[PDB]
Design a protein around this ligand. Structure first.
Ligand SMILES: *[C@@H]1O[C@H](CO)[C@@H](O)[C@H](O)[C@H]1NC(C)=O
Ligand SMILES: *[C@@H]1O[C@H](CO)[C@@H](O)[C@H](O)[C@H]1NC(C)=O
Ligand SMILES: *[C@@H]1O[C@H](CO)[C@@H](O)[C@H](O)[C@H]1NC(C)=O
Ligand SMILES: *[C@@H]1O[C@H](CO)[C@@H](O)[C@H](O)[C@H]1NC(C)=O
Lengths: 117, 120
């Protein structure tokens, strides 16, 4: 059975630096995307998906254009306190009119600290 | 992601009995159609879906002629085919979304009607 694994419960980042949000899927089935969100529930914010969207501050750790890629980790550059919150790596199954959440990672708390000078 | 050979728009006239909306994935590497899912959206509404796991094609009754050539999917071709009655009543922007296992992507194509000269 599929596991979406976020190995870090927390990440502490100095302001201006890059946060690494780790996620790995144990399998690539069932058919459907993996997306990153900030928060859970109805008001969760989309942070990343593979489609051409507006995620300029986000880069991926691995090459997500690879069919066999199982690393869904992302990097968010130029971190500020506004980026603090809990991030979730979420797997969906395909559906119409909506894709249906299948499995979520356990979450990564991104905390921010001041940088000297 | 799944990457595309993008076309901004395609034109049709009173002369087209059928129309084609192109959609071409450049890095498709699927082995079977069970691994693939296709969504064609017209003004944000799904007007054609192909669920590869169930080999099921679904269209709303206002888009009854909408279809894809399923055998072309492994080639990355997810081009939509429709008749002129559906094309004339649905001009505008379409989104073609393709999924292969965990890779996904989409592209936008505008279907544009062009008024031309005709002899009775
Ligand atoms: C789009 O991409 C292919 C290359 O993979 C190209 O040869 C072809 O001409 C393009 N398709 C159309 C319909 O222009
Ligand atoms: C309409 O017909 C012309 C040929 O008469 C063809 O080149 C064109 O691709 C067709 N338009 C569409 C959108 O299918
Ligand atoms: C695709 O896989 C299914 C089983 O999952 C099988 O029934 C089908 O014939 C396969 N098709 C091809 C072309 O390999
Ligand atoms: C279709 O979308 C493009 C942007 O992708 C936009 O420039 C164009 O005006 C839109 N056309 C219509 C009729 O909505």
């Amino acid at each position: 059975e599929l596991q979406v694994i976020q190995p870090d419960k927390s990440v502490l980042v100095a302001a201006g630096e890059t946060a690494t949000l780790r996620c790995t899927a144990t399998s690539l089935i069932p058919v459907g995307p993996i997306q990153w969100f900030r928060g859970a529930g109805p008001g969760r914010e989309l942070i990343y998906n593979q489609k051409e969207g507006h995620f300029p501050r986000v880069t991926t750790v691995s090459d997500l254009t690879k069919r066999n890629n199982m690393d869904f980790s992302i990097r968010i550059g130029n971190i500020t306190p506004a980026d603090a919150g809990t991030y979730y790596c979420v797997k969906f199954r395909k559906g119409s009119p909506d894709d249906v959440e299948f499995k979520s990672g356990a979450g990564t708390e991104l905390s921010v600290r001041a940088k000297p000078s | 992601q799944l990457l595309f050979n993008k076309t901004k728009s395609v034109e049709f006239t009173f002369g087209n009995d059928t129309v084609v909306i192109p959609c071409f994935v450049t890095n498709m590497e699927a082995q079977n159609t069970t691994e693939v899912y296709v969504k064609w959206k017209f003004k944000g509404r799904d007007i054609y879906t192909f669920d590869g796991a169930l080999n099921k094609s679904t269209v709303p009754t206002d888009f009854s002629s909408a279809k894809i050539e399923v055998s072309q999917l492994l080639k990355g071709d997810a081009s939509l085919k429709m008749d002129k009655s559906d094309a004339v009543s649905h001009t505008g922007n379409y989104t073609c979304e393709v999924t292969e296992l965990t890779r996904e992507g989409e592209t936008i194509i505008e279907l544009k009607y062009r008024v031309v000269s005709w002899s009775t």
